[model samples]
Target: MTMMDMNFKYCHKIMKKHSKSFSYAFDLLPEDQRKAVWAIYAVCRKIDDSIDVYGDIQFLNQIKEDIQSIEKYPYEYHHFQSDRRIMMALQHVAQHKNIAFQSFYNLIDTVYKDQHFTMFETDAELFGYCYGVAGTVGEVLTPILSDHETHQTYDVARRLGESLQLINILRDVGEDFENERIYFSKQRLKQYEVDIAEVYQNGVNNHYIDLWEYYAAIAEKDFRDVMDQIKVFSIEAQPIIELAARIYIEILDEVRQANYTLHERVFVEKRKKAKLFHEINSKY
Candidate 1:
């Protein structure tokens, strides 16, 4: 295999190690498409680690250069170690599938904007960020899966992307706050009579928990609604997408199982993840 092909495997290895639940869904993708997904995920993860973990402008700027290189030559050569896996994989996909630049642009915007925009003041603002960063992945992946149909699958993918972001927000509320950020909007806190005072001082509370559940409910419905429209995609794609959506919803249930308490995170347990992984793979 080529060097690019080797990186593709390495990148998926990273994904499986870090977030197997996500990797399971990704592994279900066609091999070439899966490689591209890993590369994209690797690039996104690198950007996130720089911005959120290291907080170094120099490193993030390097990421920008890598993004440009990938854009310039989506297929053959890659300049950055972190971005190469996804960009190369994507380059391979773009050779055959019609993916959008908008989703990738949105990812870049979210990563770059973090330097200036820390906290979102409104629900709209937060949604804009979530949809851009998380939804973009969904939107981009839709086209690769769209060989199942000949129509516009972009809209369906966009909604699925938004739903994914919403799930991320709900799952990471407590975790995000620890990073000196809050995904919960002031409007949301106010709507539920949740005191921002207590959140900053203590953490999300019964007030906050109540409001969060409401948000998750909306996102859950979003996945259900959009899934129908894209149901025409590959039979192989459907089970994994459905499982991904269901698992995300199940994570929300875990939060509720904890009484929506924000003190702890809610993730699908490893055993369950593995079980779901096997079950979904069996379906395909």
Candidate 2:
């Protein structure tokens, strides 16, 4: 195999290691498309790890520069501080899949902002941050999944991405609190009369539950929108996207099933994953 081809296996393993839900869904894609997803995910993961795992701003700066730089090419021959393997696969995807570099840049900017996050001032800011961090994933991947999809797909794809982000923010509220970040909008806190300090001191309570349900309703609407939007892609492409979204929606339900107490990060446990798998299969 060529060096670029070699990266496909390495990248796939990275995706599988980091995200069981995503890897579970993406693995169903045809090998060519699946390899591209893996490559793209590897790039995103490195971007996230720079801040979340390594706390290295300088490293993130290089990641920002290199992903942008690789767009115009014989970045193949250029000196790279990047994991050239990941960049090699990324270069392949960008060329063949018509990857949007701006979303990649947007994603990098969000990760850069991760170093010192400010509280979101409004729901708009919260969703905009969602778009930057996760909706961009939708933007980049939709093209790969459906090269000539209807324009409408981009709109729903972004909303689907936002739904996933809202789920992320909700699931990690306590954890984000621990990290000294509050991703919830200040406006909502005021609107709901939630005292975040009291939340930290007392753990989950009625005030937070009300706020959580408000966000949950929004996520449910976006999830419904995505379920309706699948006609944008073909049968071959649809299941993976559909399955992935369902897994995340299931994650949201898992939190609700726990009464949104959130003493632990909410996830679909392995036992329930099998049940969810059957439900997804039965629904279709």
Candidate 3:
């Protein structure tokens, strides 16, 4: 196989290992776009894992510096072939698709910022966190989806990303708590009559359920709002995005069925996801 093909293979492997839902959706793209998306996912995965999986603050700092270095000394394929393969592929995609460098830098900054344990005082503050970490992914991918760079598509793209991230936050409540983090706003928690300590305690309460439902409603609205904007993307890009969004929305439904109790992490089984994928494919 050629070196370029090998680079794509490396990206595909990383995607499959880290994001089953995303990989499934990515399969719907045309080959060139798919490869670029894989490369982007690989970089995102590396940045995310640097903190979540490794939990090494120094390593996270090193990643931050390395990403900044990419800005100062732009990566060339030849120079990055061996060690910085993901970075190489990412630069290739960014160069080809006109993805903004600021979006990439924003994601890294948000991930690094997330390392600190801070209770968000307001919904706006929490939304800012969501936009920084997840909404930026949509912003970066929009040019690739539409095959052109313009500011027009960013707001809808950001809403799509927020929808996905909000679902993730609700679903991972127990897990995030275990990691000594909470994504919910302090004001929202108080509004729902939930104590911060109760979040870390065993078993769910009525107040927690109400708060979770409230968050889910916000996410559901985001999903609804982004539906019409899907047509703004390339015809080929729509189905995969629709499928991915639907799957995440279904996950939120699963949470509701369980009465917002997250005694354990909630997940949709592969078979169920595959079934949904096929259903979406048939519809499109």
Candidate 4:
């Protein structure tokens, strides 16, 4: 196989292993865009793993260096295997697509910010965090998905990204609690009268459910904002994007179904996802 093929294959394995929801949407893309998306997913996963797993900042710095390394010496970095291959795949995609390098930096910067700030003080603070970490993914993906760009397209991409990220924040409440990271802003929690101790000790109660529903409603609004503009993407790209949005929104539905009881991580099983994917594809 060619070098780019091997790099993408390596990145694809990471996507398949870590992101079942995303993997389904990814399959709907044409091959080139699928490979580019895989590359981007791999890079995002590395940044997250380094912080959440290894507790290392240097790994984030290494990723920054790797991005630069490829620009100056693309062939020299080819011999790198494993984690370094993420950069190869990313650089390959970035060179082909007119992706803004600043978007990558925006994401990495959030990883650094995470180490310092675990709780958001307000809704605005949380939105800024989501934009840096997740919304920037949309920005990075936009140029790859579209040759013709408009402000509305990128706006929709950001909204979609934020919507998905909010779903993640909602579903991961239990897990984030275990990590001592609470994503909801303190101001909102106070407004909802949710005590953090109750969350850790008693798990989800009415207060937690109320707070979750508030955020889920915001996410739903974000999804609605994207629906009109989703058609702006290439026909080949629309279904996958729509599928991802639908699947994540359904996870929110599941959370609500259980009265926001989140002792266990909420997820849509693969069988159900397959059914939903078929249903959504028929519409788009």
Candidate 5:
């Protein structure tokens, strides 16, 4: 197999190990892009693990150095789970494809930032994190798209990443608060008469339900716009990208029906997910 093929396989392995949310989307991606996307996600999953998995401040010491060395060669950080696999795969892609260093670096930067800031004070602030964590991936993938970059497609991935992040924040409210962190904007919560402090007393209470619902709806719309952009890409990449948006949107519905309860699980069923993936393939 080609190096790209091997890297794609590695990426898929990482996703399988890390993300239940990405399975359907992974099956839908075209071969080449799927490999590349998996490689990228593997790297992301690696960095995330360093923060969430290790819970060690010293991990950042090596990460900073590793980021600098990326210009010359892949940094050798044996302790970082995703670093070796993702960087190895990505460095290969960099040699073969049109992936950018800045996008990858931004992910590293976000991981670095995550070491410091676990809570968000404002929606805008949360968006900054989303851009670093998710939007950067969109930026990197844009050039690899089968279609030449157009205005719409270029813009959609950014929105899609941000939308995905927002949904994560809404879904993980219980855990985030338990950890003494908040992702929803304090300003907005206060303005809506939703007390962030009181959320623990009553999770995603009625006052904040409308605001959470509104934010989720906006995220769904953002996915729609991104889907419009995905339509312009190659048939290979389209289905995976499109299906991911749909699944995330389904997640939004799940949270809504659960009354935006932060404590409940909000996601799609496996059987339904399989059906969606099958249907998506047939239509495409």
Candidate 6:
């Protein structure tokens, strides 16, 4: 091994620290693929944190420049005094694996758009954003997840990722609204006659419940469907994806059963999470 060990080590720590559901599933990847996934997750998390946690669009701009300049930038860790181990690992993974860097850039583009466009105007506008961000992640990951990277595999991965993002939208509606951002389509809101302000004041109620259910239904359709199409992935990678999908879909189940409470984030209890982990672990 080389200094790359430290870089991957840094990624593993961050993945373990930041991504509970993701880390658990990715942990099941064969060693090399696990490391690659860790590196990718570390970098994505950093980019996401730049905007979500730090509100540093400038940092995101710096990252945008960093990736574009990769061809010329010195690869020596000593030269990059910025403590950029996550990116160093990502660069390594991208070179060694078949990952598409443009998909990472695509995620950055989604982050930039979400920062500004808070309100979505139509079904396409809203889920299109989901497809842009999460589907791109699936796109980037497909090459790693599948031995055969056909359109069938890519499309299935993309739709599954999009479905997961939609579930996230369902789960995070409260937090997103608290930040003065709303991602649900405006047209749907109007169609459902939702009073956005009132929903905030009074969590889930008659005014907004149907619209929430409507989106949940959209996500529900994909979860069951994505599983039906799961045989397209590499057998080695299939378990990891299936487990993560089931875990997140379980979150959606919890969200619905809890009556779509929107004032706080919803989560499955840890005992159930552990059970789901073991259940899927043993099954696959």
The clash count for each model shown is: 4, 0, 0, 0, 2, 0
Q: CA lDDT of 208 in candidate 1? A: 75
- Scored against the true structure, residue 34 in model 3 reaches a CA lDDT of 91
* TM-score of each prediction: 0.85, 0.92, 0.90, 0.93, 0.84, 0.90
Report lDDT (Cα) of residue 97, candidate 5: 65
Please estimate how well model 3 matches the true structure, expressed as its whole-model Cα lDDT.
0.79
lDDT of 2 by residue, 1-284 (tens): 88777888889888999888888888888988999899989998888787644556777877777776777673355566667788778877776777778988899989887677888899999999999988998888878788585668777778888898898888877777777888889999999888776887787778788988899899988988888888686667777787888887788777777776546787876666667667766766
- Per-residue accuracy of model 1 over 115-203 as CA lDDT, tens digit each: 67666678898778877787787776776565654434666667777887888778776677667677778777778997644775676
For 193-215, candidate 4 gives per-residue lDDT tens digits of 99766776776778777888899
2 or 3: which has the higher TM-score?
2
Model 3, 34: alpha-carbon shift in Å?
0.9
Better of 3 and 5 by lDDT: 3
Question: lDDT scores for all predictions?
Answer: 0.71, 0.81, 0.79, 0.81, 0.70, 0.78
For candidate 3, the per-residue lDDT at 252 reads 88
List the candidate numbers ranked by TM-score, top first.
Answer: 4, 2, 3, 6, 1, 5
Runs with alpha carbons beyond 4 Å of true place in candidate 5: 1-10, 52-70, 73-82, 118-121, 150-152
Pairs of residues clashing in candidate 3: none
lDDT of 5: 0.70
Which 10 successive residues of model 2 have the least lDDT summed? 73-82
Candidate 3 residue-wise lDDT, 1-284, digit = tens: 88777888899999988778888888679998999989878877777777655566665666556555666655443344223777667766756666666887788888877767598999998899889878988987887787554565788788998889999999888787777778899899878888745756757788888888898999998998887777767888888888889888888878877766656767777888888889978987
What ranking of all candidate models by lDDT puts the best one first? 4, 2, 3, 6, 1, 5
Note the residue pairs that clash in candidate 6.
none
